[PDB]
Amino acid sequence: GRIGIPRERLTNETRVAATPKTVEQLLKLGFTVAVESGAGQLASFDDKAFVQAGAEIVEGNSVWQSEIILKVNAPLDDEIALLNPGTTLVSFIWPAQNPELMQKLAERNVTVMAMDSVPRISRAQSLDALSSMANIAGYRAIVEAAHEFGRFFTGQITAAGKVPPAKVMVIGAGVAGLAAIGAANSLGAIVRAFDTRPEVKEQVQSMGAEFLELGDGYAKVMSDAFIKAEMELFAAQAKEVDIIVTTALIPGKPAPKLITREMVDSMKAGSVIVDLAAQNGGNCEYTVPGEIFTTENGVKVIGYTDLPGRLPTQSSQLYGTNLVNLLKLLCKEKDGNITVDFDDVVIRGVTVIRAGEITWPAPPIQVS
Amino acid sequence: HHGRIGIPRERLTNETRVAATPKTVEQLLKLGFTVAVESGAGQLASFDDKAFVQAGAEIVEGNSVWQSEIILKVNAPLDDEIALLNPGTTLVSFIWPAQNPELMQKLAERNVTVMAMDSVPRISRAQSLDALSSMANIAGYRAIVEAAHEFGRFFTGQITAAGKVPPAKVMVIGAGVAGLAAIGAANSLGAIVRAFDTRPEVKEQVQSMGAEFLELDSDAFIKAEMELFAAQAKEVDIIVTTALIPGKPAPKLITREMVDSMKAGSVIVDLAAQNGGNCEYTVPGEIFTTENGVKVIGYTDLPGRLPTQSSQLYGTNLVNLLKLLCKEKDGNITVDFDDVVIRGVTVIRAGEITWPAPPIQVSA
């Protein structure tokens, strides 16, 4: 029952699937652990920190001689061949967006658990890698914004006068949005947030932010009238806020253009936009994914797509913990053995390949 | 023109600040002056020509800015700028007369008056003019912004579904203006802050910010001070060090061995870098990453990395000096050497060197 933690080989990836702390937890579940030399380096975990935790350090491709492989990103083409039959791989996969990856992994005769496919039910929250990375992203977004911003975020009285607080608008109050509201409010900004779902109002307000206000709900938010009013709201806000964080991103779909060139052009010089939808084209029309773009009117549009990789220690610890929590479901006894029980809707949801046969997608959850 | 203030574009390599903003321009006109800003002077600080024009300034090209009765700058004029200073002009900028006798001589020969913003006496009624404090305040804030950007973990403690994350631990060395601003920024990010200062009178300030005022236990004092830092280096994630006296080599307070003992991924922001740094690993102008994975931030331009704020506060410092110099609000400068504040700041008066000012009793 050996778990292998490979070094992440996707260029510029800084995260690792286990930390010294998560390795201790993995051993308490009866597994042994091998970590590939250098795997945690960019996340500030040296080989010897892993050895202190009770892992064995291995070089080269011998980490792939393991019953279980825990990774962040999916095996590259040249890593798929190193998966041996009967191995359980746990990583991000994105099966819906990667049919060819699925076929390649299936031929290897492994069991694959995609961390993007954890069911969004209450009991799976300790396993939800998407929420873990989103929460880090929202915090990191405000750090990135403070870095690029040329003014105090924090209102204060100095001898040379009273400085006002920065004004921050956050579009989308899902997990990333809320984290951004939280970090912004801690820095003493006047925070404002918009979300199409009225249910989140009370949550947004408890964090200290203003909830912005403008045939089922779905039709409503899709209608020309609502979309016109929403664009008007954003145009007006753009004129008075210093920082905008946009988070409206659905996996696999192009991101909606909520912040147009014209809105950004209306902004005060030195303002910052952090576009957390950059990996799907961005919520902002000026966004160049992977980069900061500066407009003619002096606005910095931040479009990095690796915010969690920019908090690599935190992301590795939280993601690693998500994996521990999945393995707690897989290994209820002492004991180092994995049981893929499809009667557990969380397991069923996450398991996208089982012994060489594609089991994705799972059915709608319908429980008695 | 008489009563015209010229705001030149800064020429110093990589300078992003400007000596006036649209808001200070509004204040300057309220004092009876007119204002010419050299085109682009505010660009790097996010003040475009149009914002100055909207505030009431006139935009001028290159040299025209020097045809003003008053010139406000950040950095001292370069040789080719000095030659464009006309007799009777009043120049306000950082000057650093001790470090620059040659410059003092060249300005004197132009028969100008010079107010050195580094020479504001450290008495309480001059706080609103103290450009050194404005900049130190900015640097402490920005030091924490740089630390958070480079740090690979949450500063802020947090309960998550995937675990409870403790807050970052921050040690600030020196609780003068910059140290206190660092404390404040770190607090805003939810960090546990500890601070050390040799002056016991800052204890209540530090404790009032919810920070721990570290205690000890001349060669006995230094050794116990180094033992505190060595012990704290093993526990904290971020060290901000601020022990700097203008014109003097910075004491090495954090040694290579101390940094070598820290948790990997830790960050040091060394605000004494411009005088060699308090950290032995510091490389002024750069981040140096140690073999054990600690980032040592040695930037010497923290205020230039917050240029909009730096310009605003410094520009206000200049307004407040002109409020003293222009009591009638009529666009006329009157230098009154009975006021110790003006006597201190005035380093050349109409061609005559007046620095150093007679000895004075002060603060800190």
UniProtKB/Swiss-Prot annotation, chain A:
Heterodimer of an alpha (PntA) and a beta (PntB) chain. Alpha subunit serves as the dimerization unit. It is a multi-pass membrane protein. Its EC number is 7.1.1.1. Its main location: membrane. Residues 2-368 are cytoplasmic. GO terms for cellular component: plasma membrane. The transhydrogenation between NADH and NADP is coupled to respiration and ATP hydrolysis and functions as a proton pump across the membrane. GO terms for biological process: NADPH regeneration; proton export across plasma membrane. It catalyses: NAD(+) + NADPH + H(+)(in) = NADH + NADP(+) + H(+)(out). It is found in: Cell inner membrane. The chain holds residues 2 to 376 of 510 of the full protein. It is an enzyme of class 7 (translocase). Keywords: Cell inner membrane, Cell membrane, Membrane, NAD, NADP, Nucleotide-binding, Translocase, Transmembrane, Transmembrane helix. One of its GO terms (molecular function) is protein dimerization activity. Belongs to the AlaDH/PNT family. It comes from Escherichia coli (strain K12). NAD(+) binds at R120, I121, S122, V175, D195, T196, R197, E230, L249. This is NAD(P) transhydrogenase subunit alpha.
